[PDB]
Design an enzyme around this catalytic site. Structure first.
Site, PDB file in Angstrom:
ATOM      1  N   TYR A  45     -15.258 -49.755 -36.238  1.00  0.00           N
ATOM      2  CA  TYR A  45     -15.311 -49.050 -34.946  1.00  0.00           C
ATOM      3  C   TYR A  45     -16.250 -49.663 -33.913  1.00  0.00           C
ATOM      4  O   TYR A  45     -15.834 -49.964 -32.797  1.00  0.00           O
ATOM      5  CB  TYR A  45     -15.694 -47.578 -35.133  1.00  0.00           C
ATOM      6  CG  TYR A  45     -14.753 -46.789 -36.010  1.00  0.00           C
ATOM      7  CD1 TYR A  45     -14.914 -46.774 -37.395  1.00  0.00           C
ATOM      8  CD2 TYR A  45     -13.706 -46.051 -35.460  1.00  0.00           C
ATOM      9  CE1 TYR A  45     -14.056 -46.047 -38.213  1.00  0.00           C
ATOM     10  CE2 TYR A  45     -12.840 -45.318 -36.271  1.00  0.00           C
ATOM     11  CZ  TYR A  45     -13.022 -45.321 -37.645  1.00  0.00           C
ATOM     12  OH  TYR A  45     -12.174 -44.604 -38.455  1.00  0.00           O
ATOM     13  N   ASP A  47      -9.249 -36.153 -44.937  1.00  0.00           N
ATOM     14  CA  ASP A  47      -9.665 -35.317 -46.072  1.00  0.00           C
ATOM     15  C   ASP A  47     -10.169 -34.002 -45.480  1.00  0.00           C
ATOM     16  O   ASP A  47     -11.258 -33.944 -44.901  1.00  0.00           O
ATOM     17  CB  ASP A  47     -10.785 -35.992 -46.882  1.00  0.00           C
ATOM     18  CG  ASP A  47     -11.236 -35.171 -48.103  1.00  0.00           C
ATOM     19  OD1 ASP A  47     -10.800 -34.010 -48.284  1.00  0.00           O
ATOM     20  OD2 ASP A  47     -12.042 -35.700 -48.895  1.00  0.00           O
ATOM     21  N   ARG A  67      -4.968 -41.084 -38.779  1.00  0.00           N
ATOM     22  CA  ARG A  67      -3.918 -41.488 -39.705  1.00  0.00           C
ATOM     23  C   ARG A  67      -3.979 -40.810 -41.066  1.00  0.00           C
ATOM     24  O   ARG A  67      -2.945 -40.531 -41.682  1.00  0.00           O
ATOM     25  CB  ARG A  67      -3.956 -43.001 -39.897  1.00  0.00           C
ATOM     26  CG  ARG A  67      -5.228 -43.486 -40.540  1.00  0.00           C
ATOM     27  CD  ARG A  67      -5.125 -44.940 -40.938  1.00  0.00           C
ATOM     28  NE  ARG A  67      -6.276 -45.344 -41.736  1.00  0.00           N
ATOM     29  CZ  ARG A  67      -6.505 -44.918 -42.974  1.00  0.00           C
ATOM     30  NH1 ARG A  67      -5.655 -44.084 -43.553  1.00  0.00           N
ATOM     31  NH2 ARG A  67      -7.601 -45.296 -43.619  1.00  0.00           N
ATOM     32  N   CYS A  89      -9.660 -44.794 -39.939  1.00  0.00           N
ATOM     33  CA  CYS A  89      -8.972 -43.530 -40.157  1.00  0.00           C
ATOM     34  C   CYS A  89      -8.546 -42.963 -38.810  1.00  0.00           C
ATOM     35  O   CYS A  89      -7.557 -42.236 -38.697  1.00  0.00           O
ATOM     36  CB  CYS A  89      -9.931 -42.546 -40.810  1.00  0.00           C
ATOM     37  SG  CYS A  89      -9.520 -42.135 -42.487  1.00  0.00           S
ATOM     38  N   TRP A 143     -22.076 -44.374 -44.709  1.00  0.00           N
ATOM     39  CA  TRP A 143     -21.386 -45.665 -44.795  1.00  0.00           C
ATOM     40  C   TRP A 143     -22.020 -46.700 -45.720  1.00  0.00           C
ATOM     41  O   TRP A 143     -21.624 -47.867 -45.699  1.00  0.00           O
ATOM     42  CB  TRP A 143     -21.188 -46.292 -43.410  1.00  0.00           C
ATOM     43  CG  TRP A 143     -20.213 -45.574 -42.525  1.00  0.00           C
ATOM     44  CD1 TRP A 143     -20.388 -45.267 -41.209  1.00  0.00           C
ATOM     45  CD2 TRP A 143     -18.924 -45.061 -42.887  1.00  0.00           C
ATOM     46  NE1 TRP A 143     -19.296 -44.591 -40.727  1.00  0.00           N
ATOM     47  CE2 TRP A 143     -18.378 -44.448 -41.740  1.00  0.00           C
ATOM     48  CE3 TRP A 143     -18.175 -45.054 -44.075  1.00  0.00           C
ATOM     49  CZ2 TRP A 143     -17.123 -43.833 -41.735  1.00  0.00           C
ATOM     50  CZ3 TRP A 143     -16.925 -44.444 -44.074  1.00  0.00           C
ATOM     51  CH2 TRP A 143     -16.413 -43.841 -42.910  1.00  0.00           C
ATOM     52  N   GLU A 153     -24.370 -41.475 -36.318  1.00  0.00           N
ATOM     53  CA  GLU A 153     -23.232 -42.368 -36.494  1.00  0.00           C
ATOM     54  C   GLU A 153     -22.599 -42.707 -35.155  1.00  0.00           C
ATOM     55  O   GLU A 153     -22.314 -43.871 -34.883  1.00  0.00           O
ATOM     56  CB  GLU A 153     -22.170 -41.754 -37.415  1.00  0.00           C
ATOM     57  CG  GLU A 153     -21.023 -42.715 -37.754  1.00  0.00           C
ATOM     58  CD  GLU A 153     -19.738 -42.001 -38.147  1.00  0.00           C
ATOM     59  OE1 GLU A 153     -19.289 -41.118 -37.383  1.00  0.00           O
ATOM     60  OE2 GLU A 153     -19.164 -42.334 -39.205  1.00  0.00           O
TER      61      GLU A 153
END
Ligand code: D16
Ligand code: D16
Ligand code: UMP
Ligand code: UMP
Lengths: 283, 280
Positions: B109, B192, B189, B169, B83, B61
């Site tokens: 991103y 989990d 922000r 995020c 994703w 990633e």
């Protein structure tokens, strides 16, 4: 325990464990990277008491921000000189902005908060209806959907950076709601513990009180996150003194009337009660 | 003493003092607003051990990010499905992006990190030379001026928000340098704790290792700051079990060759040594 103790323990830590680190001016600092404090906004206001904070300045500046101004003279006229130095003909020239008129700070907080992404010309330009009105955005969202985890107001704009006299110290802030209480977290990339920090804590605690008042919620917490938390080498002596003092109970902030929108706020609406600090300190 | 104890104490805290808070799907969570942990990057890698982390996924990633891609298929082809859900024809439609092709995640991103402020069309578009190349920016600055307090790479873009399948995020990260060591702080922000978080810590710790390697510096610390730190109501039981386990010593990350530029990194250049986690 008193809320101020956190700020004091931080300063104490930066001295005890910080590292000598050069400044952009070459003054020299003692710094620590990454810090965090949680100041309660429940029935009290985080206006530091071990040293007097320029409250009239934090209030005029904030309104100035909300009004979307980028002209230092409009804040200077209110008796708050803080942003004047960065507006002088000398300083703006030492950075290349020669045609930029005096007081024109560039696309700073006022512009980013209200017109994010709009093409900045000069301070006197009309940006009505342009860019993203982030301030309004977060207020709407807090009202309609409180559970939302994307309530962010971002002052950091990578594209507008070359037009700024000074890159935003407060890159971004995020709002949160639970148990009918509104909280706020700030990301301060760089913070001067001896001068700017205390004022900055007050500034954002106030903003929360404002937004909470308008949205119908109660103030919760103010989470203060720092990147480069520094203490200038000269401020070490007076600070060793301030650290000796004992924090007196925090004042309380009263909003004297019921205002409906964020823009409707005026200086006469706010009242600081019981702000009894220790004697002031020059830095 | 063990670094993972921080992450554990946080989860422990979210259970003990969190508040029930609704989700965007209505699943329900237990949350705390504003948290922070300092993971050391000195002679060890923060790949959590009380539960196995999908390391092959964090690596593929990250490279995918660096490459500036916004096509989920390009990461899926590498055997990392994370994703894909956000790229399906069904999901992209439940948000209005009907003409948007399958896999087209929007200006995420990859796009923000390399072309901030550029006009996004579709994933297959050519954005060469467009926008602000933030990734390169921070690398240059770290080299030329380490004392700089404005080394920021911002993925949060208020103007491009309406074109994203998922709002970042990880709003922004900031680099710092002292004693010849490079540190990184992330502003997440929303996180989990039971799934994304441990993976997220690994992702940014790795990025620091890469940038440190390139700039000639040694890895310092990774400061993990959180906004809405939550735990889903269903993950409470397995988490109570994970909290019982004892963290095993963190592995070490080896960069097998001397690479010059950030783009030059390949999967064969990295090696995780001694990653002995607990089962399932
Ligand atoms: C190196 C540096 N550190 C800072 O903290 C800093 C802060 C500002 C702006 N800021 C947000 C400030 C808050 C409070 C201030 C101050 O000057 N207080 C004076 C009163 C001067 C007046 O009457 O205007 C004092 O404490 O005596 S200045 C601009 C450049 C900086 N530069
Ligand atoms: C509610 C929610 N919480 C999350 O943490 C989350 C994370 C991502 C993306 N993220 C960056 C992820 C990191 C790791 C992942 C995962 O699915 N791991 C699996 C499957 C892959 C495998 O192991 O082969 C696992 O570890 O079991 S997903 C997308 C939606 C989310 N949604
Ligand atoms: O509200 C503010 C504005 C500025 N500063 C200080 C922090 C640094 O001392 C300096 C900014 O320098 P750079 O990080 O931009 O180089 O100003 C604060 O502390 N608070
Ligand atoms: O790297 C990631 C990506 C996603 N999430 C999780 C956190 C939230 O549960 C969800 C995003 O929800 P919103 O903040 O978009 O509402 O995905 C993570 O924890 N880490």
């Amino acid at each position: 325990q008193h809320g101020e103790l956190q700020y004091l323990r931080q300063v104490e830590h930066i001295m005890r464990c910080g590292f000598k680190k050069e400044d952009r001016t070459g003054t020299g600092t003692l710094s620590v990277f990454g810090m965090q404090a949680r100041y309660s906004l429940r029935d009290e206001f985080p206006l530091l008491t071990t040293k007097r904070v320029f409250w009239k300045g934090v209030l005029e500046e904030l309104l100035w921000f909300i009004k979307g101004s980028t002209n230092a003279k409009e804040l200077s006229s209110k008796g708050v000189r803080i942003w004047d130095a960065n507006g002088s003909r000398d300083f703006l020239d030492s950075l290349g902005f020669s045609a930029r008129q005096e007081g024109d700070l560039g696309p700073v907080y006022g512009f980013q908060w209200r017109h994010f992404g709009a093409d900045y010309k000069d301070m006197d330009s009309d940006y009505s209806g342009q860019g993203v009105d982030q301030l309004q955005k977060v207020i709407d969202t807090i009202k309609t959907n409180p559970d939302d985890r994307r309530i962010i107001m971002c002052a950091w704009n990578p594209k507008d950076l070359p037009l700024m006299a000074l890159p935003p110290c407060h890159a971004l802030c995020q709002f949160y709601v639970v148990n009918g209480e509104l909280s706020c977290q700030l990301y301060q990339r760089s913070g001067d513990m001896g001068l700017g920090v205390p004022f900055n804590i007050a500034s954002y605690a106030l903003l929360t009180y404002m937004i909470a008042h308008i949205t119908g919620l109660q103030p919760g917490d103010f989470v203060h996150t720092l990147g480069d938390a520094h203490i200038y080498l000269n401020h070490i002596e007076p600070l060793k003194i301030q650290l000796q003092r004992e924090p007196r109970p925090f004042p309380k902030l009263r909003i004297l009337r019921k205002v409906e929108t964020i823009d409707d706020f005026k200086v006469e609406d706010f009242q600081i009660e019981g702000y009894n600090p220790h004697p002031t300190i020059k830095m």
